[PDB]
Amino acid sequence: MDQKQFEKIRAVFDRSGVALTLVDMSLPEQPLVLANPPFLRMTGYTEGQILGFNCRFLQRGDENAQARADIRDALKLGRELQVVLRNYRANDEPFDNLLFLHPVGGRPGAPDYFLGSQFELGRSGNSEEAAAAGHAGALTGELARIGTVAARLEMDSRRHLAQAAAALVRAWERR
Amino acid sequence: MDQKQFEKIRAVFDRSGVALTLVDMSLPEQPLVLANPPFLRMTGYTEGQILGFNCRFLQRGDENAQARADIRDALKLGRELQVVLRNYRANDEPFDNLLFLHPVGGRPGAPDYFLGSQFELGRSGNSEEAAAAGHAGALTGELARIGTVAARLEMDSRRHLAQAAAALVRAWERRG
Numbered sequence: 001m002d003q004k005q006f007e008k009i010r011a012v013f014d015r016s017g018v019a020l021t022l023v024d025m026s027l028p029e030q031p032l033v034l035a036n037p038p039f040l041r042m043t044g045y046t047e048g049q050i051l052g053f054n055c056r057f058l059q060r061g062d063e064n065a066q067a068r069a070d071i072r073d074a075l076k077l078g079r080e081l082q083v084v085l086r087n088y089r090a091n092d093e094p095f096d097n098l099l100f101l102h103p104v105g106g107r108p109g110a111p112d113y114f115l116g117s118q119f120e121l122g123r124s125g126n127s128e129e130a131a132a133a134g135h136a137g138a139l140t141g142e143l144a145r146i147g148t149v150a151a152r153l154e155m156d157s158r159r160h161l162a163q164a165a166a167a168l169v170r171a172w173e174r175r
Numbered sequence: 176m177d178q179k180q181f182e183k184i185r186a187v188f189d190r191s192g193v194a195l196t197l198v199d200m201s202l203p204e205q206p207l208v209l210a211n212p213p214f215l216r217m218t219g220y221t222e223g224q225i226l227g228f229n230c231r232f233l234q235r236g237d238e239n240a241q242a243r244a245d246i247r248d249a250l251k252l253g254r255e256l257q258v259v260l261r262n263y264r265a266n267d268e269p270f271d272n273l274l275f276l277h278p279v280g281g282r283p284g285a286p287d288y289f290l291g292s293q294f295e296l297g298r299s300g301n302s303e304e305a306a307a308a309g310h311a312g313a314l315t316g317e318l319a320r321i322g323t324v325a326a327r328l329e330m331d332s333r334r335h336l337a338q339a340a341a342a343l344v345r346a347w348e349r350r351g
């Protein structure tokens with residue numbers, strides 16, 4: 001996909017109010033090539049340390065067995081996916097992470113990039129379900145400005161993505 | 176408000192995927208001066224037939240008496256407000272409208288414009304709560320692009336607007 005389209009994704013990332021990451025999928029390691037300020041603000045890292053590496057560095061040891069396996073399928077398959085990950089800030093302090101993965105660019109089942117958006121659980125008090133839904137609606141806004149969600153489908157896509165995020169938080173709150 | 180700021184609002188309205196309206200607060204009639212495609216697509220009216228009218232044309236009679244009193248106070252005070260109205264499309268189909276009101280520009284207690292954003296209840300099946308919160312999330316995104324929510328405050332704003340939206344839905348479903 002063009003640098004025209006790539007620079008447009010960059011601009012969306014810069015102004016976005018949700019944490020956004022974009023990994024290159026043509027490489028084996030799937031390195032970070034974009035990471036916006038809301039994401040840096042969450043994680044404690046800065047651009048220097050993270051661009052060019054795989055996003056696993058947010059995990060410690062081995063604690064996300066079932067969830068990394070679901071990622072690895074969704075990624076190889078080119079499907080979107082919402083999953084919760086035990087993650088850690090740069091100061092090692094922990095946080096659960098509702099991660100949204102969206103295929104970007106390329107062709108079906110082989111996207112040029114994957115987009116990832118992280119919602120921090122535990123920060124929203126009594127309304128994690130609403131707050132995750134909120135996150136999913138804001139993310140849908142960004143996906144439309146990028147071109148992945150067609151305008152004619154933006155409303156129903158937003159509805160189904162907020163619903164997925166709320167169901168996920170309901171399970172997580174029952175773990 | 177600056178001409179440049181108004182043009183920015185117009186550009187946000189025209190590309191947004193949520194319904195957005197802008198009302199001129201400097202006239203007591205409080206007319207619609209902007210109404211974007213999703214709003215037109217949900218109400219069924221054209222742009223030309225509604226600009227310059229007050230948004231109450233979506234209602235009939237003296238319905239929404241209490242909610243309307245809440246709106247009038249929040250408009251006078253320059254306060255944000257979320258509230259459900261009975262409304263009608265141009266073909267007189269009725270729908271319940273979760274309306275989001277946001278003051279725009281001016282000073283506290285005295286905004287230049289009010290922004291309004293309409294979420295249609297009854298259309299998301301069993302996910303009414305998550306759909307409204309999702310709407311609130313997209314809206315906060317638009318309010319940030321306008322400059323009304325500070326860049327760093329967006330995530331907080333969103334969390335709180337989505338929770339407000341969700342409570343209203345839960346109450347609305349309890350009526351029957």
Ligand SMILES: Cc1cc2nc3c(=O)[nH]c(=O)nc-3n(C[C@H](O)[C@H](O)[C@H](O)COP(=O)(O)O)c2cc1C
Pocket residue numbers: 021022023030054055056058059068069071072075085086087097099101114115116117118
């Ligand atoms: C776009 C994108 C964003 C990702 N964001 C995160 C993240 O925020 N936190 C995390 O723990 N893993 C994240 N991952 C997952 C890892 O990069 C990796 O793909 C996953 O853990 C499965 O890899 P592994 O089991 O082989 O290590 C992301 C993956 C992609 C493609």
Ligand SMILES: Cc1cc2nc3c(=O)[nH]c(=O)nc-3n(C[C@H](O)[C@H](O)[C@H](O)COP(=O)(O)O)c2cc1C
Pocket residue numbers: 196197198205229230231232233234243244246247250260261262272274276289290291292293
């Ligand atoms: C920006 C804005 C948007 C509004 N959108 C709607 C709307 O979609 N539907 C509706 O019934 N009223 C809407 N209203 C409210 C009416 O215009 C009016 O303020 C309300 O009915 C209370 O005033 P009244 O009792 O004198 O009619 C909106 C008001 C503002 C300022």
Ligand SMILES: [Cl-]
Pocket residue numbers: 078079080
């Ligand atoms: Cl998919």
Ligand SMILES: [Cl-]
Pocket residue numbers: 150151152153
């Ligand atoms: Cl389209």
Ligand SMILES: [Cl-]
Pocket residue numbers: 213216217
């Ligand atoms: Cl519509």
Ligand SMILES: [Cl-]
Pocket residue numbers: 221222223224
């Ligand atoms: Cl007309």
Ligand SMILES: [Cl-]
Pocket residue numbers: 199206207208226227228
């Ligand atoms: Cl007018």
Ligand SMILES: [Cl-]
Pocket residue numbers: 204227228229
């Ligand atoms: Cl009028």
Ligand SMILES: [Cl-]
Pocket residue numbers: 236237238
């Ligand atoms: Cl009346």
Ligand SMILES: [Cl-]
Pocket residue numbers: 252254
């Ligand atoms: Cl007040």
Ligand code: NA
Pocket residue numbers: 120121122123124125128131
């Ligand atoms: Na949270």
